[PDB]
Ligand binder design. Structure first.
Ligand SMILES: Nc1ncnc2c1ncn2[C@@H]1O[C@H](COS(=O)(=O)NC(=O)[C@@H](N)CO)[C@@H](O)[C@H]1O
Ligand SMILES: Nc1ncnc2c1ncn2[C@@H]1O[C@H](COS(=O)(=O)NC(=O)[C@@H](N)CO)[C@@H](O)[C@H]1O
Lengths: 452, 318
RNA sequence: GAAAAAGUCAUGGAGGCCAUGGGGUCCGGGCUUUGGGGGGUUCGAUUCCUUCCUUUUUUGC
């Protein structure tokens, strides 16, 4: 067990994470209460040890600084003086003793700092007072748009509709792409591309900046984003260490954008700078069938960096949620906006807002988009600072929203626009992209298996 | 290795043409400095007009093919070793160009090095109808490559680990004439796309493993001063079918090995290198071609209004 | 993707601070130029060993 951020700080790749433990060090009761409500990896029965280690590290650092000051002073004195002089011999002996003490105290301090940082990086972020407490069951409802479409017959599943239209293939795909795979064909791919282009244009029309991030990122970006690349119960893919070392797959475009903005200032006049990026995302994830839970899936994520004020960050998150609601209303999908609890917020999240669409074929609502606001978790981890008009650097805020997810959107559209005959209608916004008012049966003949 | 056609002309400028990287860095559309730890070496970060250019080049050819009749199909990105070996790729060796997944976490999982393998796996052990032929399917996906040429042009976008490619696969009948005509159609389609974009290119026939014929299209690059391959259409007569047991049901009903044809529609790295080095201006501007004007929205690219991102890291002179 | 060389205004020596060639300001003269980052030997390491990064040489798909 180790931490990539500490390794980078040790090797000099980046500065040491400037944690805000002191923010709550003055009132351990509030921090313990928040940790208990979040119920993260770290419990409330281990904070005192972390504080004790931090205090000991501070004292050792102070003693080391004092010793370094004395050594520098004696070295300067020797330099200004410049063998048999008793003063020279005394200074040499004092320097030897100081060096011995420094080498004796250095490993102790290094081990203490390593332990303290490895125990402190596991702490979660703050929580908004308006965020309800409890499990997923305690999800507050904020807005409900649309209604459940009325069906004159039993609605069929999304997988069944896709197999009938020959647009989504999932049978006998083990030897092709492992489990939880699919092959979008025809109208399925056309609908996916239309949705992606529509979302991209709608986002570019409101001032957003398009971007493109890689898919193979190092574990450092994930650790700074608040993830666990190397872990037994992890779900993030990892390339072969023999072929490449310290390389991981991009779980989401947000990680790529954070890596891009890592160690880079932003102009105050340019802030808030928002960037939308559409790319594929892979997740091990190790329902039993369908496109609900898949490994690889296309997605467009919006990352915004605003000023330091919480009012500005809140307004940015509100704007993102409003844009997502307008996109869903434009596409014609019945959904509900929920407020995630403290136990499901996450490590870096502070105020998460999820969106659940109505899936008649599934029989219940399903999450199809999420948005979160992190005040300083990412900035303090990746050292994402920003300068002001004067010239001082301050940690900026970061908000990450999911513009659209093709798997859940396709599931919702196929289960909502279905018909009695078997066709699926198209919304009034993607008709231009699809070139068809409705999706009829396919003209080509499906493939027949002739293998073992 | 013999050239067959040559369309277009080399641009003319009153100054020494600059490189694509220099223009991108000046306009701040791409970034490649200080990314060894973020996304490894050789990793670009497109922004501003760069992303709009990529989307334009990934939605122009796709739409053009969709208007001529094409069956779009989205393929996966995590293929198995069987599909890779069936195509003719051997990731078992150490100096391979296919990213291998950790065997401890997964078993026999390999990253998709290109969309060709993904489109080939769709027909693995599946008989296609006779009337459906010819079956053409375009697929735009991200392709990763483990090995790059570091010695030659290391600081550049020519050879990058990950890119966004758009391939065009085609399944034809058992007759070689049909496969040849389909390859000719694909070549003419890509040539028309290149001409519409306004890029000077040259098509050539490579000499002489599993592919029977390979047509390579190399675009002009004033900044580099030498042509560069931008596409390569290969024609495998029966290697893919013989390795993957791909067949088709004829009229009589007997199973036969079907001919496969694959061709690259467009590569974003090379297309943007050609566009940046060809449409160069005196003040670093970049004129948008007459086809991507509707997508980019700007008749002439200019310097960005926002301030570029500085560096506040330890690796800097203080 | 691998192996090798250099290292910050340039050349050359110098672990206790430089010679020459340089850049800018002021009256040929004068002022003035601390070396890319993180680790070890040392009383003090821009100089001895190692690592990150920038540049350069060989091999290869
Ligand atoms: N294993 C998965 N398979 C398919 N789709 C998924 C999977 N996990 C999440 N999604 C989809 O992607 C959306 C993104 O929400 S999220 O993963 O929990 N949050 C993020 O990705 C952060 N980068 C902020 O957006 C989900 O709402 C859901 O629609
Ligand atoms: N390392 C690379 N980095 C970026 N782009 C590449 C790279 N290698 C090939 N390409 C792009 O892909 C095109 C086809 O070359 S190829 O990858 O070797 N051949 C194929 O992909 C086959 N599927 C032919 O359809 C090239 O012309 C170039 O545009």
């Amino acid at each position: 067990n180790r931490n990539l951020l500490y390794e980078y700080a040790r090797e000099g790749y980046s500065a040491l994470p400037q944690l805000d433990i002191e923010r709550f060090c003055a009132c351990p009761e509030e921090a313990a209460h928040a940790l208990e409500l979040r119920k993260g990896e770290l419990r409330s029965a281990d904070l005192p040890a972390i504080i004790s280690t931090w205090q000991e590290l501070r004292q050792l650092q102070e003693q080391i600084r004092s010793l370094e000051e004395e050594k520098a002073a004696v070295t300067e004195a020797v330099r200004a003086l410049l063998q048999q002089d008793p003063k020279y011999q005394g200074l040499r002996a004092r320097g030897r003793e100081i060096r011995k003490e420094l080498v004796h105290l250095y490993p102790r301090e290094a081990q203490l700092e390593e332990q303290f940082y490895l125990q402190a990086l596991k702490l979660p972020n703050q929580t908004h007072p308006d965020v309800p407490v409890g499990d997923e069951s305690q999800a507050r409802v904020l807005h409900m748009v649309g209604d459940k479409p009325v069906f004159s017959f039993q609605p069929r599943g999304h997988l069944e509709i896709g197999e009938k239209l020959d647009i989504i293939r999932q049978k006998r795909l083990s030897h092709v792409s492992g489990h939880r795979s699919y092959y979008l064909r025809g109208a399925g791919a056309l609908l996916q591309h239309g949705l992606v282009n529509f979302t991209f244009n709608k986002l570019l029309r409101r001032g957003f900046t398009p971007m493109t991030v890689p898919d193979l990122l190092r574990g450092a970006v994930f650790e700074g984003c608040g993830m666990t690349p190397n872990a037994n119960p992890s779900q993030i893919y990892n390339i072969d260490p023999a072929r490449f070392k310290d390389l991981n797959l991009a779980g989401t475009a947000e990680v790529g954008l954070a890596g891009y903005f890592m160690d880079h200032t932003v102009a105050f006049r340019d802030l808030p700078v928002r960037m939308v990026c559409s790319s594929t995302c892979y997740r091990a994830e190790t329902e039993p069938r369908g496109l609900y839970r898949v490994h690889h899936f296309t997605k467009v994520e919006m990352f915004g960096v605003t000023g330091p004020g919480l009012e500005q960050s809140s307004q940015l998150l509100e704007e993102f949620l409003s844009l997502q609601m307008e996109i869903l209303t434009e596409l014609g999908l019945h959904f509900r906006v929920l407020d995630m609890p403290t136990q499901e917020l996450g490590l870096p999240a502070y105020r998460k807002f999820d969106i659940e669409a109505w899936m008649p074929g599934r029989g219940r609502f399903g999450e199809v988009t999420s948005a979160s606001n992190c005040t300083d978790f990412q900035s303090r981890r990746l050292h994402i600072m920003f300068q002001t008009e004067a010239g001082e650097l301050q940690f900026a805020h970061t908000v990450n929203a999911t513009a659209c997810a093709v798997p859940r959107l396709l599931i919702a559209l196929l289960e909502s626009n279905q018909q009695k005959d078997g066709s699926v209608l198209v919304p009034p916004a993607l008709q231009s992209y699809l070139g068809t008012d409705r999706i009829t049966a396919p003209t080509h003949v499906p493939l027949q298996y002739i293998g073992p | 290795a013999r050239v067959l056609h040559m369309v277009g002309d080399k641009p003319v400028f009153s100054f020494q043409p600059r490189g694509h990287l220099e223009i991108g860095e000046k306009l701040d559309i791409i970034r490649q400095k200080r990314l060894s730890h973020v996304s490894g070496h050789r990793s670009y970060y497109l922004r501003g007009a760069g992303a709009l250019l990529q989307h334009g080049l990934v939605n122009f050819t796709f739409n053009k093919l969709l208007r001529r009749g094409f069956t779009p199909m989205t393929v996966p990105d995590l293929l198995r070793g069987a599909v890779f070996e069936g195509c003719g790729m051997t990731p078992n060796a150490n100096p391979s160009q296919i990213y291998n997944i950790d065997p401890a976490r997964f078993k026999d999982l390999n990253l998709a090095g290109t969309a060709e393998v993904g489109l080939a796996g769709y027909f693995m052990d599946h008989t296609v109808a006779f009337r459906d032929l010819p079956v053409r399917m375009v697929c735009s996906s991200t392709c990763y490559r483990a090995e790059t040429n570091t010695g030659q042009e290391p600081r550049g976008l020519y050879r990058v680990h990950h890119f966004t490619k758009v391939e065009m696969f085609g399944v034809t009948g058992p007759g070689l004439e049909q496969s040849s005509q389909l390859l000719e159609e694909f070549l003419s389609l890509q040539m028309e796309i290149l001409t519409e974009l306004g890029l000077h290119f040259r098509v050539l026939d490579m000499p002489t493993l599993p592919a029977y014929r390979k047509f390579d299209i190399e675009a002009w690059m004033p900044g580099r001063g030498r042509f560069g391959e931008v596409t390569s259409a290969s024609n495998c007569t029966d290697f893919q079918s013989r390795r993957l047991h791909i067949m088709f049901q004829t009229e009589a009903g007997e199973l036969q090995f079907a001919h496969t044809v694959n061709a690259t529609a467009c590569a974003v790295p090379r297309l943007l290198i050609a566009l940046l080095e060809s449409n160069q201006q005196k003040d670093g501007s970049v004129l948008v071609p007459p086809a991507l004007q509707s997508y980019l929205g700007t008749d002439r690219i200019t310097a960005p209004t926002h301030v570029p991102l500085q560096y506040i890291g330890p690796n800097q002179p203080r």
